[PDB]
């Protein structure tokens, strides 16, 4: 009969964490790729390690293009400039082992499953956990690159535990925890008050969740203590081993497969964005407050083996999750080619999706973010 | 209003699949330290492509092991022993860039999922899922089907009802790499006989496969090579394959190359033991939990119950969360002393998933605190 | 006092041994870029070791070549084309680490180079070295061709001549040949096929019967079977035979290698020059032997230092000083002069980078022309 | 008919040259390996490039050594410590790849040479000695703070002029090309190095009386040289055969020394050639003496010698009668070279830089003159 507080996490990490250095280094010879052969097939994994750069996988492509000074300044873009900051794209090891050699029909390139979510919760319909996530990480990267805070490198952290109720819904923040590498000219001290003033306290006023912040509210900066060198020193980074950060932050269920590094024929970043599309218009046309949708593929058939709508009772108008499913498999054509050619998915976009989450940036102009379909979805429900 | 049913799917893959391998490599390493040195310290990585195994992370340890013949070794285990089958242990490249010390980590989200619809506790998708791909690699090895290679994925979906449990197996997929001497016809009658049929019997599921079943067998033609060649595979790139095939959340930490100090790996078997305790001590027939840790905290910043409606008698989530904070000491040091988890009992893991396995005696699959958490909610 | 008879050996290895696989790959690379753009600036090494081949270095190019491919091609035509022979093109690991970013130019380095040429065989070339590159370019034959079957890529090839009192070649005492060969054949079986179709064919082949006469000493595969090959257990490097690209140990050696270099880099193209130097004095009739020592300074034209040495075979009452002034007044040995007189802006090299850089009758190089022999007369007033 | 001065060169260059940086890596392993294992068998080649070092080749030993630390300490001490100055070991890529009585035969068959002359007092040819004279001597001005603003990676070059016996008669060229800090320009570190590494070097070696008159001194003639070592000039093991020995005076076989243990003959025989080259001008034989020795893999017994003493031979004797006293005073089996010059020690990460032989700052027992003695009563001699 006691009862507990349930809480609630998720975390986001900076463009300079060695997983986001991959997945960057990954995007950014896919976009490359794409922008001279739009029809580039891509599956390009790199692998960091202190002094190295290991980029290893296949493409076909018409395209040429210099991986290597690719991969060296995207490192300098990031800030690993030096190796008194652990990293130095001007003078690091980079290796390249990819092989070159070996219409809505076609058939899966591979099997899988994939999920996609949206609520509304948020205005960009996120949950509210990844949200303020990767709004401190954004902004923890923004007060760097712009010196709002001075003497900070770029590996960094953040991670949010809200209180939530008995319904699952958030009803208060309760903990945020932020590690940012730094010189060695500032201490923990310093760098406290200037990231619960320039970070913290500027990102619950720009997000408006004031009324979520009120009280106690408990703040962790850098309680590990020093954090001089960072990136891939004494550490390692693999592409698509931040799958839940680009994603919905541990809120929504997720099929296991990474995004970066991989042209849009993938099913695996396609069909996952279809299903962001999908959930967002079940949302945003009223349907539910929150959806989750699961797809699957099997390798050389056009049609999914599975779809699987879940709106955690929050269905509006008298609907079930079975009803809301028909109107999805009316509105929607789930073949991957009809996703790459309604999403206008063979552009030069990805290497934007690689750091901060891949879903609800309202600084990008993305596809699988339009709710677009919203009027068809209630006219197959024949709603007003 | 028109209604559909709703379909739900997971997936397995064999020992042979190149992300499999970089898993199976980093958790070979690490058992062969911890055979030596129980405080190994060990966050290693792999990565193979085509002719290549690099191996990369760190290692604090006083246990001296020969990686390279460990690699080799674990190749020529799984079935890749020539340049037929498109990859071999014995003439492959191993590059090695571990480093042994400096010179000059509690934190994140994890969950953990038990469901009582299985024996093992675990969702039925998934647990399917991993009867194929094991039984695929099992009916190579003793050859009960021939003309087989390492490389292979199986993926299973079944029909849903209303209220979110499972109803039939509705589509089978297996994709196995095979020798040029067999086609997709040949594998079709020998899978559905000796691999499809034999799981639907041993997992006695019948009364879920009876009507139409799709099988799909190397539905895109032939596959002879497999593995690395044409095929990159790293370590932790198959996380929902290693959990609950996507019936349960992720935190999104990877399991293989990684010591139990690491709560990615320690914390998330933790909340497979306090999921498989809740459902075993009959608080609910379904249950979800996260934890997560705050840097130089050791207690859990975080702790989130769901049982998704189907919890029993009159208890809230909230309050078994209550009585799961009385009964289970959270910080890593007491769950690493508490599963015994410094022995080498990892590379086990590496394929076929780390819960609900039959085959292994795992300590976080122990039901030993269903006494306590009854005790800690009054109940008889 | 005891006397002993001085004994002299050279070797050569074949296009299978890992050392020459770097070779060709480094100038397999060259040459396809070459092949495009005939400016392009290559300075590529390539390693070897089991499972896998690291291409390295630097490429100033407008080019493009799909180096992978360039590989796995080069090493099939070897022969490594499965895990069996113990390396295979179409499975190994390919790792690629190369950053992409007129007759007064300097040198682009120091450096000494040295060249050599000798009237002892119509090649112009040391009897003991043209003997074990005769010897490693057969062993290659008999099994490209079928003429010794059971033979696999990877080979070495060592010549031991006795010499006179006076410094030449008096005859063949041993000859080793070590060949990779499938585990069917054993030692007894080589030693059988190796004498007939490879050591009696190429003695016959050379014309050195008068020198091949009484007991030689013929040591085929002595340590053993040689199943595994290649890279795997013996790790190779580009410029690691620079003795078997050169003379055989018969001159001097500067210590610069050829292979993966373009001609910009005077370890190369000054070396061609040396020997096309050589070649000419010995052909013009100034000496049987000669050898020559070119230096350079960085970012300096003309060279620092030329050194002619004879041997005291030296004719017509000439001395080494007086040859050399014949050769400054001849040669232009500026760098960019040598690249133009030699047409070395061409996809020529990978043919250079196994069986020797010199003296070779299947090719047709540049550096190995007799064409200044007048030019050598007419400097000291000769008829 | 006129006549031109013959002018003779060898190079050295300094231990951040990227591949005397390999040389090094290479034997720092192979000392660390004998150190606790005397019987280890050690090919282990060094690649560096850009960013990285790759370790590759086999050892077969019951010793473990930490090879990543091993490769970052040694770059630390040749002073590649910051990516300003183009490489750092302690944030740099580190690779490994290797995989893990007396008729005892060669474990491979080839040709050495060893060459000795009485025209130094270390037996070694006036050139070579004088470049590597340089080449310490410029890394000796950086480590020791002499003249600041160098930078590890370098070059040295001299040039003889060479009289009509095939001697050397007067220093002609000295090139230095070293690594710098911007702060420093060509002009400066010509007056830096004119003083401090080429008028001190002339003055230690004792060679006043060669460098009277014009010398003409080339110091960075190509201009600036900020970044060096392996970024844009790769590096490899055995790629500087001609300096680790006697700088072109002297024929080579071919072979490689660093990162191999003693039983591989292309280190051991050239050792032995070095010690019975030595001797033989000890002995008062000849003022010169260049010897070839050769193996076939699984013999013991050498296949070939051939002794070349090009007219300096002395007491009458011939080079064929110098050989008979060589076969019979020394034992050249590769396990009776090891015994006798006690290879099994790690001594040989010091030979990876400034050359293996003439090393008046080390004592390698192939420079030893202990077999004089028997090398005369085998000739019959006073
Ligand atoms: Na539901
Ligand atoms: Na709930
Ligand atoms: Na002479
Ligand atoms: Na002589």
Excluded at 63 to 75: E, G
Excluded at 199 to 220: M, R, S
Excluded at 323 to 332: D, M, Y
């Amino acid at each position: 009969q006691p009862t507990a507080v349930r809480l609630f996490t998720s975390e986001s990490v900076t463009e300079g964490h060695p997983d986001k250095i991959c997945d960057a280094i990954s995007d950014t010879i896919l976009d490359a790729l794409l922008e001279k052969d739009p029809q580039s097939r891509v599956a390009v994994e790199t692998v960091v390690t202190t002094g190295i750069v290991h980029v290893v996988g296949e493409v076909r492509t018409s395209a040429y293009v210099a991986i290597p000074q690719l991969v060296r300044n995207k490192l300098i873009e990031i800030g690993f400039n030096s190796s008194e900051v652990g990293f130095d794209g001007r003078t690091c090891g980079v290796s390249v082992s990819i092989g070159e050699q070996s219409d809505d029909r076609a058939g899966a390139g591979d099997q899988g499953l994939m999920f996609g979510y949206a609520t509304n919760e948020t205005e960009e319909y996120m949950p509210l956990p990844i949200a303020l996530a990767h709004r401190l990480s954004r902004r923890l990267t923004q007060v760097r690159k712009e010196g709002i805070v001075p003497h900070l490198r770029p590996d960094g952290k953040t991670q949010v535990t809200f209180a939530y109720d008995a319904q699952d819904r958030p009803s208060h923040l309760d903990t945020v925890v932020i590690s940012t590498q730094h010189d060695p000219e500032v201490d923990r001290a310093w760098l406290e008050t200037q990231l619960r003033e320039h970070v913290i306290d500027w990102v619950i006023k720009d997000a408006g969740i004031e009324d979520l912040a009120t009280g106690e509210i408990t703040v962790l900066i850098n309680p590990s203590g020093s954090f001089i060198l960072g990136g891939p020193m004494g550490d390692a980074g693999l592409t698509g081993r931040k799958i839940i950060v680009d994603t919905y932050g541990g809120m929504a269920r997720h099929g296991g497969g990474a995004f970066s590094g991989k042209d849009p024929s993938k099913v695996d970043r396609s069909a996952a964005y279809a299903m962001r599309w999908v959930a967002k218009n079940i949302v945003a046309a009223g349907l539910a407050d929150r959806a989750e949708v699961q797809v699957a593929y099997a390798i050389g058939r056009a049609k999914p083996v599975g779809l699987y709508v879940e709106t955690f009772d929050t269905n509006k108008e008298g609907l079930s999750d079975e009803q809301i499913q028909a109107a999805v498999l009316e509105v929607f054509d789930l073949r991957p080619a009809a996703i790459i050619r309604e999403l206008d998915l063979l552009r030069p976009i990805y290497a934007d999706t690689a750091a901060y989450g891949h879903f609800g940036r309202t600084d990008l102009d993305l596809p699988w973010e339009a709710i677009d379909r919203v009027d068809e979805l209630r006219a197959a429900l024949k709603l007003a």
